[PDB]
Amino acid sequence: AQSVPWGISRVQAPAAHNRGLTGSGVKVAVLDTGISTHPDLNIRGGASFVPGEPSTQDGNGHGTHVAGTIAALNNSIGVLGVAPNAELYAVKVLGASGSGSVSSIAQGLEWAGNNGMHVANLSLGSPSPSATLEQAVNSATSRGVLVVAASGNSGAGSISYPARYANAMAVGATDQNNNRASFSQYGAGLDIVAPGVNVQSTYPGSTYASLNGTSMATPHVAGAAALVKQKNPSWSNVQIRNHLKNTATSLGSTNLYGSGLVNAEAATR
Numbered sequence: 001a002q003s004v005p006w007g008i009s010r011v012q013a014p015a016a017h018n019r020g021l022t023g024s025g026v027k028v029a030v031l032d033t034g035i036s037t038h039p040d041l042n043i044r045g046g047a048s049f050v051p052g053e054p055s056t057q058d059g060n061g062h063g064t065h066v067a068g069t070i071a072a073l074n075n076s077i078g079v080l081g082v083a084p085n086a087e088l089y090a091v092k093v094l095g096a097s098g099s100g101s102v103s104s105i106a107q108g109l110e111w112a113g114n115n116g117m118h119v120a121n122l123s124l125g126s127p128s129p130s131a132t133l134e135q136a137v138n139s140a141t142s143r144g145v146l147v148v149a150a151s152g153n154s155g156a157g158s159i160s161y162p163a164r165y166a167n168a169m170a171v172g173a174t175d176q177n178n179n180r181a182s183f184s185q186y187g188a189g190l191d192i193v194a195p196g197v198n199v200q201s202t203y204p205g206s207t208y209a210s211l212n213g214t215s216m217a218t219p220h221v222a223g224a225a226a227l228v229k230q231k232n233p234s235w236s237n238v239q240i241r242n243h244l245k246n247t248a249t250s251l252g253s254t255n256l257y258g259s260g261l262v263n264a265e266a267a268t269r
């Protein structure tokens, strides 16, 4: 039996799937710890920029978790992603330890822009700005990639890099009450929010696990962007990014929530 995690239904993904929108033909790169082979995922390709782990398989579990929120297959097992037909690429920029260098992250973004990815999911971040990173963000953007990044889990009133950069779409996390989760960073540069508490998804060892973090909120928006792209194949990263914002549900302060909760129902109309 397949269950639909609460955040998937919170963002109204099923409403989009009932219209024929599942992310089919949209390429999404997950820059993280890798993606393990899983029966509820279809991994199309990828690369590792982690010296010492040439493989794209996930030794941490974080990337596999992220990937399942975007694109867990719509079938009779496990869970269901926001864009279950998206073409998934495993871009390994963090090691098993769950950390990596800006150098690896920059290479992964370059890779994405060279391989015609539509959306890049960066569920990672630093409190410190990086010129290398910023340049990579900007270069992927001008190659048509929509970069989506987590605001960070420090709970502070400023957001992480690269989500802080203008060309990154910064995602914070809400709870089941539609409140900002305590750990979700907010402040200037924050674009939108999505479910981030108790998120159930695919996990290595062919299983499922629930995690919390802005890292879990991000993939709901990457997924929502694939739905929109499928519906409006001619739209640019910018067009997609503003439509998501314009159609999000207001939750109170733009300081704490940016544009509001992403809404894939309102967006694919």
Ligand SMILES: [Ca+2]
Binding pocket: 002, 040, 072, 073, 074, 075, 076, 077, 078, 079, 080
């Ligand atoms: Ca499934």
Ligand SMILES: [Ca+2]
Binding pocket: 163, 164, 165, 166, 167, 168, 169, 170, 189, 190, 191
């Ligand atoms: Ca931003």
